[PDB]
Ligand binder design. Sequence first.
Ligand SMILES: O=C(c1ccco1)c1c[nH]c2ccccc12
Length: 267
Amino acid sequence: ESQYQVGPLLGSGGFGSVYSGIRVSDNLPVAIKHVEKDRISDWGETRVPMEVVLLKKVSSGFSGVIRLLDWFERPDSFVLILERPEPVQDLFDFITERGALQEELARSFFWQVLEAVRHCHNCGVLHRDIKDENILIDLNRGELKLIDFGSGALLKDTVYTDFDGTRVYSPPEWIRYHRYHGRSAAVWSLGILLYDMVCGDIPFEHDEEIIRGQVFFRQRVSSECQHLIRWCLALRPSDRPTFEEIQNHPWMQDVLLPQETAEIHLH
Ligand SMILES: O=C(c1ccco1)c1c[nH]c2ccccc12
């Protein structure tokens, strides 16, 4: 408040409003995110938004998650202080500009995504909204960072019957039954994401295509990549790969380091 210098609004949406900021104490770049208390669906613990509980559980030590540095409670909103990489661009914008990604780049991005989601999972947190817009690229370090835990939940082994993430990334068992388990629904969304990365667009727009589960490639994509995608997008949850199987898949071998990724691909 006196502790942060606010700059430009970065965006707004169902997550609230995110401003670029600086922490005055040491000039650290931050993102400052406000949600209205009324617009908060889900709470935990003092009563904080679930997002804060989930962020505190994943923000310890380092990872591929944008870390929560601090939060404040205002009379009708909560304010989250988050890390801000600089320069940064979300993976959606990045794909809009460059179109479908070279596989070497998608492999590096995808792997970093998988490490970040494993970390969330090891921490007891299910993100539930993995997609291009929720992934930030630190364009100098080539490091990807998960954002927006606002639809996430504690990880658990029983079935989830609520979902408020992105539909076109939701699995067919959610579409048909409003039931999914955490890991396998995450894996499906990783399949959409991987397809999006290598094709330049998500594979399915309509409930029907999701449920049909048939994947058509519109760009040239290697067979190993199409196979990994189709495995993530297995119609039966239990036919999907574990994170381990995904990272042991042949398309995933020999990943570039993040730094290499930036040098070759991001300049
Ligand atoms: O954390 C973020 C976020 C976006 C939506 C919900 O949380 C950020 C959105 N744009 C950003 C830019 C830099 C760091 C975080 C974010």
